[PDB]
Amino acid sequence: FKRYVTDRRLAETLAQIYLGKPSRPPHLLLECNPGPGILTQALLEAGAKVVALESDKTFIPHLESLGKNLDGKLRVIHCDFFKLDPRSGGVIKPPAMSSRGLFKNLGIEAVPWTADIPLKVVGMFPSRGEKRALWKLAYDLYSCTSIYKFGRIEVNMFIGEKEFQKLMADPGNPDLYHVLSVIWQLACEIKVLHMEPWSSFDIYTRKGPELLDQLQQKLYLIQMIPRQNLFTKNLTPMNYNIFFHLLKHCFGRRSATVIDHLRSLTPLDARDILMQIGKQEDEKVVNMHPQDFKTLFETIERSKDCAYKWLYDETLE
C-alpha cells in the first residue's frame, strides 16, 4: 500500500524542510507518487521545479491540468521509482521506464562522482517493501548504475520505525546490527531530518482512500547523500560483490570471531591480516565498526605478493 498527506499543515511543514534545506535555487525535485497533489501544491507555492512521477495513469490528468493551467513547472511523467530500470525483459512498460530515457527527456545529464549533486529525489518508501527497496538502492549505488549512474543523489524518504532502527544499528547495539546497516552507513550520511506520527497521513489502498500499528508506527524522514570518497582504489564497483559476500558471510555466524571467518573467506594468514588493521585476534563480529569492515576488505585486497586472495568465484550464488 501507499500513504499520502491529507492535511494542509503537514504539507506546509514538509515544504520548507524539502525545499529550503538546499539554499541553492536550481535544485529540481523528482517527487515520487504525488497522489492527490496537495504536497505538490505546497512545493509549487514554494516555487521548486517539481517533476511529478505518478505510478499509475489515474491521477495524471488532474496534476497535469494544474501544472499547465498556470504554466507551472509540474511535469507529470508516467513512471514509478520502485520499478525504475527493470532488468527483466527488453520491452519496458511505461509505468516502469528506463533510467536513461527518463533522464534524457527530463533534461538532466551526468556528472563526475567527485562533482556536486545533480538533483534530489523525494517521496515515501513502500509500505511493505522497505528492505527490498533498500537492497535495490544499495546494489545500484555500489554498482554505479541506474539512478546513481549520473551522480550522487539525495534520497529524502519517510521510513518505518523498525527499518529505521535496523538501519541505524551500530556495534553498540548488536541485536539489530546486520549487513544492511554496514552497507548503507559506509555509503550514505544518514541523518533524520524529521519525525512524524503516521496517523497524520492517509493510506490510499488499491480501491482508494497492521493498519493501526502502522499509524502508531512513527515514520522518520531520512536523507541519504552518498559519501564523496566511498569508491577507492581497492573498493570499486567491479569488486563490490566480494565485499557484499564478506559482509553477508561475517553475519552468518554473528556470535563468532572475525579470525575464524577469515579462514573460511580467504587463504591468507588471519593473524597477519588482523595485525595490519590494529585489532586483537579475539574480536567478535558484532564489535566490528562499519569502517573497520571496509578497512579489513581493503587490507585483504592489498596483498602484495600472492596469486589468490578470495573464495567467491561467482560459482556461489
Binding site: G252, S264, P267, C306, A307, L311, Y312, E314, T315, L316
Partner: protein
C-alpha cells in the same frame, strides 16, 4: 515409534554383531539398563540382537543374563529370543535337559518349532544349528490373464541365445567379479592426448608427494577418531566406533582420497558429501562382507553353471526363462541419521586432516587446509559449501592426469546381469541395487514390493531381466569421428561441446560455466566409450516408483543424447532378409524428420531419391556434401546412413547382417492411453489410433483449429486476431499440447507460448500479453473439442487424488500387471538436524510415515503417474511377447528398438498387446481397488468420487491392429 536415538542404538547393536564387538555392545546395554530413564530407550529387538551376537560365540551365561534383564524389564520373550538360546547350545553341545526346557517354554506362546523356522528369518547356518539342537529332544507360475501366454510351457517357444562360447562368458564373468571386488575402474582419458613438459612433471611429482602426506595424515586421523569414539563407548554413550571398524583403515583412506579427487572445482554441498560418503561406505561394507562370508564362491559356481542357458554352444534339458532356470538350478541398511552422521565425520576428517603449502609457485612456510568451508546464499537461505583451494585446482589442471576413476556401478557390466529373482537380489553381482529408484531413507516402495504375493511381481522382474540381457557394443567409426571433433575444436551446433580453452564479461562467464559442465559430461561418456570400444557389455535395468525402467549405469546408456544413442549398437546381428532394407531406409528418413507427415511409401521413395547424399555422407562424413548434419539428429542419421550404405554396397542385401537398432516411436503415447481408456472417437483418429492412409499429427490438427478460430475472429474485426496472420503453427503450440498429459494449466501454457513468440521477430512485442492470453484459450478450446474424454479422466483422477490426500493418506494403485505403486509426497514440517563442529547439517527424514500427505503434489501428479505406469505395463507386455519369439528388444520408455529384419514382427505384437492391455477394464478395476483400499474404514464424498467413473466412448479397439502409424 522409531525415535532418533532408538534407531541409532539399534544400528549400533547390529553393527557390533557384524564386527563381533560383543564386549562393547554388552557393556553399553548394561549401562543403558542401569539408568531408569536410559532404560526406556531399549526395546526387545536390542536385547535379541545382543543375545544373538553372543549365541554365535557360545557364551550361555551371557544369554542367561540378558534373558534375566528382559524378564525384569517386563518384556515378554518372543520366538527369536528362544531361537538364539536354542542355536547357542548346538555350537556349545549342551545337555538335553536344557533343550527340553527351552522347547517346553514355547508352549506358553503355542507356536511350534517349525513355526519358529517359518516366522523367524533366521540365517541358513542359524537354521541348521537350531535344527541340530532340536534333533536332540524332538516353483509357482503366475496365473494372471495378461501374462498367461508368457509363462505357459505348452506352445512354441524360441528363446534366443547369445553369440559367445561358454568359456568366453565365464572368463568375462571372472573379469567382472574381479573388477567389482576392486570396486574401482581406471580409464584412460580421451582428452589431452599427450603433454610432454617439465612443468607437468613437476606438477605430477608435487601431487604424488602431497598424496603420500595426505594418506599418512588421514591414517593418523582415523586412528585418533577411533580411539576417541572408543573412549566415548566406555563412558556409557552412543558413538560410531563399530561403523568405522567395519572396513579396513587403508580401504577408508583410499575411499577418502578418491572422493577428494572427485570433488569439482566449484565445490559441493555438505549434505551431498555426507550422503555420498555414507553410500560408498555401505557399498564397500556389503561387498567385503560377502567376500569374507564365502558367498562369492557359491555365486561363482552357480553363475558358471547358469551361463550354459545363455551360451551359444551350450544347451539345457528344457529351455526356460533365465529367472526360472536360476531358481531351478539352486538359489544361493543403516538408518538415515546414522548414515548422515557417519558421512559428516568422514567429511570433517577429510577437511581437517589434509593440508597443503599455501604457495606452490616456488620453494610458503605455513600449511593451509585443502578444503574450505564457505557459505552460499540463496534469497534468505544459506548452504554450506566445501570448496577446494584454488591453488590445488590449478595444480590439478596443470598435472593433466591421464587416468580418470569410476565407481564399480558407474561402468557397464562386462558379464550378463544377474536375474531379478527378488526385489532383494538382482542386477550387479556383489554391489547392492534397489529395484525402485528413490531417496535413501525411502522404504515404503520396497515394503510394498516385498509384501506382494511372490507370483504377482514376476511379470515385472522377468521383463527387467530381458532388458538387462541385451548385449551392446561401441560403433567404432562413429566414435573415431566424435573423438576427432572432441579433441581438437568441437562443434556445438552438432552436439560435441567446445573445449574450455577455446573462446566460447559476466555473460561470457555464465556461458563458460555451462560449457565446462557439458565438456565434463562428455569426457566422462567418451572416456567410457573409448574404454569399451572392443568389448561386449551389458546394462542392467531397474524401475522407478511408478514402473518405468532405466539403466543402472548413468554415465553411458541408450537413454542419453544424440551421441549416446549414436555409439551404441547391438553386439549380435541378424540378416536383413526381405524387408530389412526398407525398414532401414524408413528409419533413416524418420531420423532426418523432413517427411514426418508423409506415408511410409513416400518416405521409402524419398530415401531412394536422396541416395547419392547418403553414399557421399557415409563415405566422407566430414569432407563431402555433409548432408547428414542437416537432420534433426545428426549422429544417429550418420550411423543409419553408414549402415544403409554398407547394406546396399554388399553383394546381397538380404544376406547382409546388420547390428544397427531401429526405433518405432509412439504417437503422443500419453494421449494414446487417454484415448484408449476413454474410448474417444474423434481423439483416437487424431492420435493415429485408427487406420488411415496418411499419418495424423495432433500438433498440426491443434494448430489448424487455432488458425480457423483466428480467421473467424479476424472476420469479426478484432485487433488481437488481425495481428495474427499465419503465425499459428505446430512449432508455436507443440510444447503446450505435449504437456497436457502432464496436467499443464492455462498459466503454464501461456509462459511457453510467450517463449515461442519471443524468437518470432515478425510478431510485434506490444501484443505479446494479449496474444498469449488469446492463443491459450484457443488452444484449450481446441483440445476440449478434440479431447473431451481426456479432460473428464484428468478431472476425475485429480479429484480422487485430492479427496484421498484430504482423508490423510497417500495415493496408491495396482498396475494391470500386478505391480503396486505408492506416491512419495509428504510434508516436511518438523525440522531434522545434526549438530557438528564444522556445521549443522539439515536433512530430510525421507522414511517418515508420520508426516502428513502433501495434497498439492499428490493431486497434481496422479494422472501423469498413472499414464506412465500404463506405458510401462504396455512396454513390459511387448518385451515379453517379443522375447517369446526370439526378438532382441530394448525400449526408451515408449521408443521400441529392434533389429532391422525384425521390425514388422515387433509391430504385430506391439499393437496386439495394446489391444489386450486396454481390453481389461482398467478404469473400473482402478475404481474397485481404490474403493477397497481407501474407503473400507466425509467418506461419502470419497466413495462417490471413486464410484462415478467416466462413461466409455463409442469405439472398437481391435482396429488398432490394422493401424499402420500407431507406432512409427
Amino acid at each position: 515409534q522409531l525415535s532418533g536415538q532408538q534407531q541409532r542404538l539399534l544400528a549400533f547393536f547390529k553393527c557390533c554383531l557384524l564386527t563381533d564387538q560383543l564386549p562393547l555392545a554388552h557393556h553399553l546395554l548394561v549401562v543403558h539398563h542401569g539408568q531408569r530413564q536410559k532404560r526406556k530407550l531399549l526395546t526387545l529387538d536390542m536385547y535379541n540382537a545382543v543375545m544373538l551376537g553372543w549365541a554365535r560365540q557360545g557364551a550361555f551365561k551371557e544369554l542367561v543374563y540378558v534373558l534375566f534383564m528382559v524378564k525384569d524389564a517386563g518384556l515378554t520373550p518372543d520366538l527369536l529370543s528362544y531361537a538364539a538360546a536354542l542355536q547357542c547350545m548346538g555350537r556349545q553341545d549342551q545337555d538335553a535337559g536344557t533343550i527340553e526346557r527351552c522347547l517346553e517354554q514355547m508352549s506358553q506362546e503355542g507356536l511350534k518349532l517349525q513355526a519358529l523356522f517359518t516366522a523367524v528369518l533366521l540365517s541358513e547356518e542359524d537354521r541348521a544349528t537350531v535344527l541340530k539342537a532340536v534333533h536332540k529332544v524332538k516353483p509357482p507360475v503366475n496365473t494372471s490373464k495378461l501374462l498367461r501366454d508368457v509363462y505357459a510351457k505348452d506352445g512354441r517357444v524360441s528363446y534366443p541365445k547369445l553369440h559367445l562360447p561358454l568359456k568366453t562368458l565365464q572368463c568375462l564373468f571372472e573379469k567382472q567379479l574381479h573388477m567389482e571386488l576392486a570396486s574401482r575402474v581406471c580409464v584412460v582419458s580421451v582428452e589431452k592426448p599427450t603433454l610432454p613438459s617439465k612443468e607437468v612433471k613437476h606438477a605430477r611429482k608435487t601431487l604424488k608427494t602431497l598424496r603420500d602426506q595426505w594418506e599418512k595424515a588421514l591414517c593418523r586421523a582415523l586412528r585418533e577418531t577411533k580411539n576417541r569414539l572408543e573412549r566415548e563407548v566406555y563412558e556409557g554413550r552412543f558413538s560410531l566406533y563399530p561403523f568405522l571398524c567395519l572396513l579396513d583403515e587403508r580401504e577408508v583412506v583410499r575411499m577418502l582420497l578418491q572422493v577428494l579427487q572427485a570433488l569439482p572445482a566449484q565445490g559441493e554441498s555438505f549434505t551431498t558429501l555426507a550422503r555420498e560418503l555414507s553410500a560408498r561406505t555401505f557399498s564397500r561394507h556389503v561387498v567385503q562382507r560377502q567376500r569374507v562370508s564365502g558367498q562369492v564362491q557359491a555365486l561363482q559356481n552357480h553363475y558358471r553353471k547358469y551361463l550354459c542357458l545363455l551360451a551359444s554352444d551350450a544347451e539345457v534339458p528344457e529351455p526356460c526363462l533365465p529367472r526360472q532356470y536360476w531358481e531351478e538350478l539352486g538359489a544361493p541398511p543403516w538408518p538415515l541419521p546414522v548414515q548422515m552422521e557417519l558421512g559428516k565425520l568422514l567429511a570433517e576428517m577429510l577437511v581437517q586432516a589434509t593440508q597443503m603449502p599455501c604457495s606452490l609457485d616456488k620453494p610458503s612456510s605455513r600449511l593451509v587446509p585443502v578444503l574450505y568451508h564457505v557459505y552460499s546464499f540463496r534469497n534468505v537461505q544459506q548452504i554450506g559449501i566445501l570448496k577446494p583451494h584454488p591453488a590445488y585446482v590449478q595444480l590439478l589442471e596443470k598435472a593433466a592426469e591421464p587416468t580418470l576413476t569410476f565407481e564399480a556401478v558407474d561402468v557397464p557390466m562386462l558379464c550378463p546381469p544377474l536375474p531379478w529373482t527378488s526385489p532383494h537380489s538382482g542386477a550387479f553381482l556383489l554391489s547392492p541395487t534397489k529395484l525402485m529408484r528413490t531417496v535413501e531413507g525411502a522404504t515404503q516402495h520396497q515394503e510394498l514390493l516385498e509384501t506382494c504375493p511372490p507370483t504377482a511381481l514376476h511379470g515385472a522382474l522377468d521383463a527387467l531381466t530381458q532388458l538387462g540381457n541385451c548385449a551392446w557394443r561401441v560403433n567404432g567409426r562413429v566414435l573415431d569421428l566424435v573423438l576427432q571433433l572432441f579433441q581438437a575444436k568441437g562443434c556445438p551446433q552438432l552436439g560435441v561441446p567446445a573445449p574450455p580453452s577455446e573462446a566460447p564479461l559476466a555473460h561470457c562467464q555464465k556461458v563458460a560455466r555451462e560449457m565446462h559442465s557439458l565438456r565434463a559430461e562428455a569426457l566422462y561418456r567418451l572416456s567410457l566409450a573409448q574404454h569399451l570400444r572392443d568389448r561386449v557389455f551389458w546394462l542392467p535395468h531397474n524401475m522407478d516408483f511408478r514402473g518405468r525402467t532405466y539403466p543402472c549405469p548413468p554415465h553411458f546408456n541408450h537413454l542419453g543424447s544424440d551421441v549416446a544413442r549414436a555409439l551404441l549398437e547391438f553386439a549380435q546381428g541378424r540378416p536383413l532378409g526381405p524387408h530389412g532394407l526398407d525398414w532401414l531406409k524408413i528409419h533413416l528418413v524418420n531420423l532426418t524428420g523432413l517427411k514426418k507427415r508423409e506415408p511410409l511409401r513416400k518416405r521409402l521413395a524419398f530415401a531412394e531419391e536422396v541416395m547419392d547424399d547418403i553414399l557421399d555422407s557415409a563415405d566422407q562424413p566430414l569432407t563431402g556434401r555433409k548432408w547428414w548434419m542437416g537432420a534433426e539428429e545428426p549422429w544417429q542419421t550418420l550411423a543409419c546412413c553408414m549402415e544403409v550404405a554398407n547394406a546396399v554396397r554388399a553383394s546381397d542385401p538380404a544376406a547382409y547382417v546388420s547390428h544397427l537398432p531401429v526405433h518405432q516411436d509412439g504417437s503422443c503415447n500419453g494421449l494414446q492411453h487417454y484415448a484408449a481408456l476413454g474410448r474417444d472417437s474423434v481423439g483416437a483418429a487424431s492420435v493415429n489410433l485408427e487406420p488411415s492412409d496418411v499419418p495424423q499429427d495432433v500438433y498440426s490438427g491443434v494448430a489448424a483449429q487455432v488458425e480457423v478460430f483466428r480467421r473467424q475472429d479476424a472476420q469479426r474485426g478484432m485487433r488481437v486476431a488481425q495481428v495474427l496472420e499465419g503465425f499459428i503453427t505446430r512449432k508455436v503450440v507443440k510444447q503446450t499440447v505435449m504437456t497436457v498429459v502432464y496436467g499443464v494449466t492455462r498459466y503454464g501454457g501461456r509462459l511457453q507460448i510467450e517463449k515461442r513468440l519471443r524468437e518470432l521477430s515478425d510478431f510485434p512485442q506490444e501484443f505479446v500479453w494479449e496474444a498469449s492470453h488469446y492463443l491459450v484459450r484457443q488452444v484449450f478450446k481446441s483440445l476440449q473439442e478434440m479431447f473431451s474424454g481426456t479432460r473428464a479422466i484428468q478431472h476425475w483422477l485429480t479429484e480422487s487424488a485430492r479427496l484421498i490426500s484430504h482423508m490423510g493418506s497417500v495415493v496408491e494403485w495396482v498396475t494391470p500387471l500386478g505391480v503396486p505403486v505408492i506416491q512419495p509426497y509428504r510434508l516436511d514440517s518438523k525440522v531434522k538436524q545434526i549438530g557438528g563442529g564444522i556445521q549443522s547439517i539439515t536433512y530430510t527424514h525421507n522414511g517418515d510415515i508420520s508426516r502428513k500427505p502433501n495434497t498439492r503434489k499428490q493431486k497434481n501428479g496422479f494422472p501423469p503417474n498413472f499414464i506412465h505406469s500404463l506405458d510401462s505395463s504396455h512396454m513390459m507386455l511387448t518385451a515379453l511377447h517379443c522375447y517369446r519369439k526370439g526378438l532382441t528388444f530394448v525400449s526408451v520408455h515408449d521408443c521400441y528398438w529392434t533389429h532391422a529384419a525384425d521390425v514388422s514382427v515387433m509391430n504385430q505384437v506391439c499393437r496386439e498387446q495394446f489391444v489386450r492391455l486396454h481390453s481389461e477394464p482398467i478404469l473400473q478395476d482402478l475404481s474397485r481397488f481404490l474403493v477397497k483400499r481407501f474407503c473400507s474404514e466425509e467418506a461419502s464424498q470419497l466413495k462417490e468420487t471413486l464410484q462415478a467413473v467416466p462413461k466409455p466412448g463409442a469405439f472398437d479397439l481391435e482396429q488398432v491392429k490394422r493401424s499402420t502409424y500407431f507406432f512409427s
